[PDB]
C-alpha cells in the first residue's frame, strides 16, 4: 500500500472497464462490484504486467479481492527484481 502504486492500478482498472474519472475507485473497492467478469479480471492483471514489467503466477491471482489486495502484491514483486 502506497499512493503511486494505487495510482496506476486505479487508472488501469478504469481504462480497462471503461469508466470516466468521475467514477469512484477506492483502495477497498472490489472488482466484481465495479462490473467485471472473470475475463476482465485476468485481462487487468495482464495489463499490469505489461505496465510494470513484472509478472504474476496464477496461484496468487485468485486472492485478488480488491485494488488494495492487488496493489499489495505488485509492491512485493517489484521488491524482488528492482
Amino acid at each position: 500500500a502506497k499512493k503511486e502504486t494505487i495510482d496506476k492500478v486505479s487508472d488501469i482498472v478504469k481504462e480497462k472497464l471503461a469508466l470516466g474519472a468521475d467514477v469512484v475507485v477506492t483502495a477497498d473497492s472490489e472488482f466484481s462490484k465495479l462490473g467485471a467478469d472473470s475475463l476482465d479480471t485476468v485481462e487487468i492483471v495482464m495489463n499490469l504486467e505489461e505496465e510494470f514489467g513484472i509478472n504474476v503466477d496464477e496461484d496468487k491471482a485468485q486472492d485478488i479481492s480488491t485494488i488494495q489486495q492487488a496493489a499489495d502484491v505488485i509492491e512485493g514483486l517489484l521488491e524482488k527484481k528492482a
Binding site: 467478469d37 475475463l39 485476468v42 485481462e43 495482464m46 509478472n55 503466477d57 496464477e58
Partner: protein, 348 residues
C-alpha cells in the same frame, strides 16, 4: 458413490425463449424446406463406413486388415487419444438428437413429424451415425486401444447426457450447433491433415470425409441463424452474446472412464498440445461467425442489444491475447496414463 461420473454444475434453465416466438419457426417451415434441407445429401449418394474399411466379403480381407494394423503401429499414442476422443464424442449421438428435440419451435413432436425441422433433425442424425460406426470399427481393427474401456466411457457419457445451456431456445441451440459443427470441421481437418503426415492416407481420407459432412451441416446451421438475424436482429445478437458468455461447453465434456475424474480436460489438453483443436481455434470459430452473420453490420438494436453486439465482436482478439499469455506462463506438461490406451502414457 465409488464410481460417479461428473454432473453438470449449474442450475438448469428451461424455456428462456418467449413462447410467442414459436410462431416464427412455424412460419419458416416452408423456408427450411427450400434453403436448409437442400444441404442434406440424398441417402443413395452417401458414403458408408464400409467404403473406407476392409471389405469382409472379399478374399483380400486378411491382408486389408493386416495393413490397417501395420500402418496403425506407426501412429503415436497421443494421436490415438485424440482419435478415441472423437470416436467417443461421435458415438454419443443419441444425446444430440435428443437435445435438438428439446428446442421449442423445431422439436420433433412425434418421432416421425413431417415438419421441415423434424425432417432435418432425423436426416442429420442419420448422417452423423456414420461418423460413430466408422471410427468405432476402425479403432477396433487397429488393436491399439482398449476397446472395453472406450465402450465403458461411452455408456458413462450417454448416461451422463449434456447441457449445452441452450435452454430450449432455437436461437441459442442453432447458434450453439453452428459453432459446435465448425469446431468438428476444424478438428477433423487437422486430424486428417496429421494422419496424412504420419503416412496413413486411408485414415486421412476417413477424417477428411467426416470434415466434408461437417461443413455441410455447418452451412445449414449458420443459414438458419442468418435468417434469425434478418428477422429478429435483437433477440439473435442477445442470444449469440449469451452463448459466448456461458462459453460453448463441448458436448463430450462429462467424459468418464471410471478412473479419470477430469478425463475430458486431460483429453482436451492433448488435443490442445497436438494442435488438433486449440484455444486459438475457438477464437477463429467465433470470429468466423461474427463475419458470417454480419454481426458488425447490424442496424437498430436495443439498449443492451448493442452492449451484446459489441461484446461479441471484440471477443476474438481478446481471447487470442489471453491465449498467447497462457502459453508463456505455461508450466511443463506432465505425462499421464489413459485407460483407452491400456494405461500407456502421453503428454498433456
Amino acid at each position: 458413490k465409488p464410481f460417479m461420473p461428473p454432473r453438470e454444475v449449474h442450475v438448469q434453465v428451461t424455456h428462456s425463449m418467449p413462447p410467442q416466438k414459436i410462431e416464427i419457426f412455424k412460419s419458416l417451415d416452408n423456408w427450411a424446406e427450400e434453403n436448409i434441407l437442400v444441404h442434406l445429401k440424398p441417402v443413395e449418394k452417401c458414403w458408408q463406413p464400409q467404403d473406407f474399411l476392409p471389405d469382409p466379403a472379399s478374399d483380400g480381407f486378411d491382408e486389408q486388415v493386416r495393413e490397417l494394423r501395420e500402418r496403425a503401429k506407426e501412429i503415436p499414442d497421443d494421436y490415438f487419444v485424440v482419435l478415441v476422443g472423437d470416436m467417443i464424442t461421435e458415438e454419443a449421438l443419441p444425446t444430440y438428437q435428443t437435445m435438438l428435440n428439446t428446442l421449442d419451435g423445431v422439436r420433433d413432436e412425434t418421432g416421425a413429424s413431417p415438419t421441415s425441422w423434424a425432417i432435418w433433425t432425423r436426416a442429420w442424425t442419420a448422417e452423423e451415425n456414420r461418423h460413430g460406426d466408422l471410427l468405432n470399427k476402425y479403432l477396433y481393427l487397429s488393436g491399439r486401444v482398449d476397446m472395453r474401456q472406450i465402450e465403458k466411457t461411452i455408456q458413462y457419457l450417454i448416461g451422463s447426457g449434456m447441457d449445452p445451456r441452450t435452454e430450449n431456445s432455437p436461437y441459442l441451440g442453432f447458434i450453439y450447433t453452428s459453432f459446435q459443427e465448425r469446431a468438428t470441421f476444424i478438428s477433423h481437418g487437422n486430424t486428417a491433415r496429421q494422419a496424412k503426415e504420419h503416412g496413413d492416407i486411408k485414415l486421412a481420407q476417413i477424417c477428411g470425409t467426416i470434415a466434408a459432412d461437417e461443413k455441410r451441416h455447418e452451412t445449414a446451421y449458420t443459414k438458419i441463424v442468418e435468417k434469425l438475424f434478418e428477422i429478429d436482429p435483437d433477440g439473435t445478437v442477445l442470444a449469440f452474446a449469451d452463448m459466448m458468455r456461458k462459453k460453448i461447453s463441448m458436448p463430450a465434456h462429462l467424459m468418464y472412464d471410471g478412473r479419470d475424474d477430469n478425463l475430458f480436460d486431460h483429453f482436451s489438453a492433448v488435443a490442445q498440445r497436438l494442435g488438433v483443436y486449440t484455444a486459438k481455434d475457438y477464437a477463429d470459430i467465433l470470429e468466423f461467425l461474427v463475419g458470417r452473420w454480419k454481426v458488425d453490420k447490424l442496424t437498430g438494436l436495443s439498449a443492451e442489444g448493442q452492449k451484446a453486439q459489441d461484446y461479441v465482436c471484440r471477443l476474438p482478439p481478446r481471447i487470442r491475447r489471453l491465449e498467447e499469455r497462457a502459453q508463456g506462463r505455461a508450466k511443463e506438461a506432465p505425462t499421464m496414463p489413459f485407460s483407452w490406451i491400456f494405461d500407456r502414457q502421453v503428454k498433456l
